[PDB]
């Protein structure tokens, strides 16, 4: 009745210390001090708690982002596809359109962004990179028009991606970088959008991805790394895309990743034994779509037709609760700053927790008001699965270009 | 030479040194998106980088304009290749370099570029003689910096420098038991050292492990090793196991040790053992008590487990 978070039953999902205070669990202990400040902050305040996504305000902050940002974004500066793509998720998720005018923007920009030789960089002139590489195809795609589509080269985009694939599965980040699973998925993902996937460009790829599974059950960044959030997806989602999703040890991840909510604040944390943080809630939650197709196209009967198999309330509640900000704009946890990473992936994760789908069953699961539902989002590229439909069946009109 | 917090500092645009070359604008297009209102300082720098950057300025100026160009903007990958473009051509003093790199690791320890060049460094040169002193000074800060350890265990396998590690471990368990990324480096040691399906030493680590978990009963990383370090060969291959947690299901429990008991007794009925139609009770029952009352978050997960329990260990 109605929100888990407030229940009195809660108060014992607290952290028990044992008696032995580390800096884990003193860190710990001031985050669920924090979150529990605003779950109690309606009794304090001696009203009804009523959960409501801030649309309009977080379209205002979207909007104009879409176009400028301060200085704070310095930081990002190689990272500007990234931005694009952020920000022209999270509207698509709110349901907001582009402006056929911003679109021919965001194309023109990317064209900039776009090396000769293959790949995106992270703003004009910039070197090609895999990371913007991902970040320009997933915004070509929201974006979806012919425009869009067409500056996407393929055939060098099918070089650039041999230019940093490996001997032993591997690919690089970029040209004289280093491998992880980042990379894996980033080009898993780039390939099959634009259909350029060749039968030995992902030779070695996934057995490359499940050397990266640990003892722990999810995937590090790199061969005997600890297990970590959005590693794990990209190793999952790379394998899915290419359909080893047989190599991992699949109930070892389950199992890793559901034991990821924090039974406190509901949200995700990246790694055990650190803290949540919002963005997870796509990173970490957006495993079980993942591992859902999977368990199922390998007949576990066991599995549920209406819901994920993570607490999709909860995290609701920790979204909808602790990570808006009241001027517009997602955060990590209660006291941190808004910003358009946030923003894009509380609100994916928001989607993933509001919508299940399998095959034939949709049901969704609405916290707070009706109007908080966001449009679905494909568990794979985080972008609308229309979107998706929209790219795959255009770029099979072409045929695989090879080197 | 010239700190871009200096109060001295001036603009490249007002050195004379930077004279002959005429800045590169950014070239954003007619009506930008994601434009960033950059500082004059930062757009400075830039517009001159991309000036050497486009002339293939092999030059030691364009060297010192990438360090204030990283300061900025340490992410920037294109500067960092340029600037090893740079340490080659202009045959730089590596070692130089590598105080260089230790002093933004330490300002910058959660930048993924700038270990990437230290690896980079490290190869060029060698020599690993000064990264796990290096590396620990960074991990006395933040014990579970994540390029931190994969630089550490890079640098351990790499050049083969295992032989302290283990003690690194221990001592780092002990300032912190609840360190996931200490755990997993324990770990990460044994299974590349002596071994785990060895006989002998899987048992000081299950030994140990139990002896943790003792002391801090709710810490899940030591669980997860246990189960981590078991799992693989069966956990019903060891049946003192059960007995012995069902020794501190009164005093120490948690919902780690049902959520443990619970793997044991799937393990148990996969292999046909003694009592399946009874032991797909004790199991059963837990995955309620862990759905309804103890483990609510991971419904979910357990009325799953007792359900493909069902699916499969029916009849
Ligand atoms: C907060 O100052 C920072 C810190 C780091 C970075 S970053 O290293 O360049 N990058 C992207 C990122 C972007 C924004 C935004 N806008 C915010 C954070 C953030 N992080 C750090 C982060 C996020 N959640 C918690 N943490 C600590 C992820 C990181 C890596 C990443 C890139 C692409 C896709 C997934 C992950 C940028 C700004
Ligand atoms: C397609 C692509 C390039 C995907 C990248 C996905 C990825 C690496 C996500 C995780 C980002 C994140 C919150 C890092 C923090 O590390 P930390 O150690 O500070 O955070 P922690 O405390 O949560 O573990
Ligand atoms: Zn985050």
Redesign the interface.
């Known amino acids: 009745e109605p929100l888990y978070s407030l229940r009195p039953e809660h108060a014992r999902?607290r952290?028990?210390?044992?008696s032995?205070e580390?800096?884990?669990?003193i860190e710990q202990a001031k985050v669920e001090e924090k979150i529990q400040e605003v779950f109690s902050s309606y009794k304090f305040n001696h009203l009804v708690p009523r959960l409501v996504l801030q649309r309009e305000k977080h379209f205002h902050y979207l909007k104009r982002?879409?176009?400028?940002?301060?200085?704070a974004?310095?930081?990002?500066?190689?990272?500007?596809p990234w931005?694009?793509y952020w920000?022209l998720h999270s509207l698509e998720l709110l349901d907001e359109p582009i402006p056929q005018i911003?679109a021919t923007?965001?194309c023109?920009?990317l064209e900039?962004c776009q090396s000769p030789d293959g790949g995106f960089?992270?703003?004009?002139?910039?070197?090609p990179?895999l990371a913007p590489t991902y970040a320009a195809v997933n915004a070509l795609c929201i974006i979806g028009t012919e425009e869009a589509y067409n500056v996407i080269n393929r055939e060098k985009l099918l070089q650039y991606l041999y230019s940093l694939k490996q001997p032993d599965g591997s690919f690089l980040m970029?040209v004289?970088?280093?491998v992880d699973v980042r990379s894996a998925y980033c080009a898993a993902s780039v390939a099959s959008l634009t259909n350029i996937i060749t039968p030995d460009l992902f030779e070695g790829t996934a057995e490359w991805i499940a050397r990266c599974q640990?003892?722990?059950?999810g995937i590090g960044?790199?061969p005997?790394?600890?297990?970590?959030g959005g590693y794990t997806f990209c190793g999952l989602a790379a394998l899915v895309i290419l359909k080893k999703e047989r190599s991992l040890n699949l109930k070892?991840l389950?199992?890793w990743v559901?034991?990821r909510?924090?039974?406190f604040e509901?949200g995700f944390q990246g790694?055990?034994?650190?803290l949540v943080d919002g963005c997870y809630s796509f990173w970490q939650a957006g495993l079980l779509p993942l591992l859902h197709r999977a368990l199922h196209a390998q007949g576990?009967?066991?599995?549920?037709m209406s819901?994920?198999?993570?607490?999709q309330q909860?995290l609701q509640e920790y979204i909808l609760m602790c990570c808006q900000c009241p001027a517009g704009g997602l955060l990590d946890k209660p006291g941190k700053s808004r910003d358009f990473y946030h923003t894009c992936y509380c609100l994916s994760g928001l989607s993933i927790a509001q919508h299940f789908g399998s095959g034939a069953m949709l049901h969704d699961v609405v916290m707070g008001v009706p109007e908080n539902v966001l449009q679905p989002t494909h568990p794979v590229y985080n972008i609308g699965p229309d979107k998706v439909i929209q790219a795959t069946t255009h770029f099979l009109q072409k045929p695989v270009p090879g080197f | 030479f010239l700190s871009l917090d200096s109060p001295t500092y001036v603009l490249y645009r007002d050195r004379a040194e930077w004279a002959d070359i005429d800045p590169v604008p950014?070239?954003?297009?007619?009506?930008?998106?994601?434009?960033?209102?950059?500082?004059e300082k930062?757009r400075d720098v830039?517009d001159y980088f991309?000036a050497v950057?486009?002339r293939d300025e092999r030059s030691e100026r364009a060297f010192k304009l990438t360090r204030d160009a990283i300061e900025?903007?340490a992410?920037?990958?294109?500067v960092w290749?340029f600037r090893?473009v740079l340490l080659r051509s202009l045959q730089k003093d590596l070692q130089e370099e590598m105080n260089y790199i230790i002093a933004i690791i330490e300002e910058q320890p959660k930048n993924y570029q700038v270990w990437?060049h230290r690896?980079v460094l490290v190869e060029w040169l060698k020599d690993p003689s000064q990264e796990l002193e290096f590396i620990a000074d960074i991990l006395n800060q933040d014990?579970?910096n994540?390029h931190a350890?994969?630089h550490r265990?890079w640098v351990i396998?790499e050049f083969r420098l295992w032989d302290n590690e283990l003690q690194y471990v221990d001592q780092l368990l002990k300032?912190?038991?609840?360190?996931?990324?200490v755990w997993?480096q324990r770990?990460?040691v044994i299974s590349?050292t002596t071994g785990y399906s060895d006989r002998a030493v899987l048992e000081r680590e299950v030994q140990y492990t139990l002896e943790m978990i003792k002391?801090?009963?709710?810490?899940?990383?030591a669980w997860?090793?246990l189960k981590?370090?078991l799992?693989d060969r069966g956990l019903s291959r060891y049946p003192n196991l059960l007995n012995q947690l069902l020794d501190l299901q009164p005093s120490h429990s948690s919902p780690y040790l049902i959520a443990f008991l619970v793997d044991i007794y799937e393990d148990m009925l996969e292999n046909q053992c003694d009592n399946k139609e009874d032991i797909l009770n004790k199991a059963l029952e837990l995955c309620e008590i862990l759905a309804k009352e103890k483990?609510?978050?991971?419904?979910?997960?357990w009325?799953?487990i007792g359900?493909?329990?069902?699916?499969k260990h029916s009849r």
């Open positions: 999902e952290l028990q210390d044992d032995v580390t800096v884990t669990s982002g879409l176009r400028q940002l301060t200085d974004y310095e930081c990002l500066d190689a990272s500007r931005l694009c920000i911003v923007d965001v023109q920009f900039l960089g992270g703003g004009p002139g910039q070197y990179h970029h004289g970088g280093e640990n003892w722990e059950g960044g790199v005997g790394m600890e297990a970590h070892s389950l199992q559901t034991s909510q924090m039974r509901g790694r055990c034994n650190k576990d009967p066991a599995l549920s819901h994920w198999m993570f607490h909860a | 950014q070239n954003d297009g007619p009506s930008p998106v994601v434009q960033i209102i950059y500082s930062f830039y991309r950057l486009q900025l903007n992410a920037n990958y294109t290749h090893r990437h690896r014990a579970k994540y350890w994969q265990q396998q300032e912190d038991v609840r360190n996931n990324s997993n770990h990460f590349n002391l801090v009963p709710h810490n899940e990383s997860n090793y981590g370090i799992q483990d609510t978050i991971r419904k979910e997960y009325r799953y359900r493909s329990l069902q699916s």
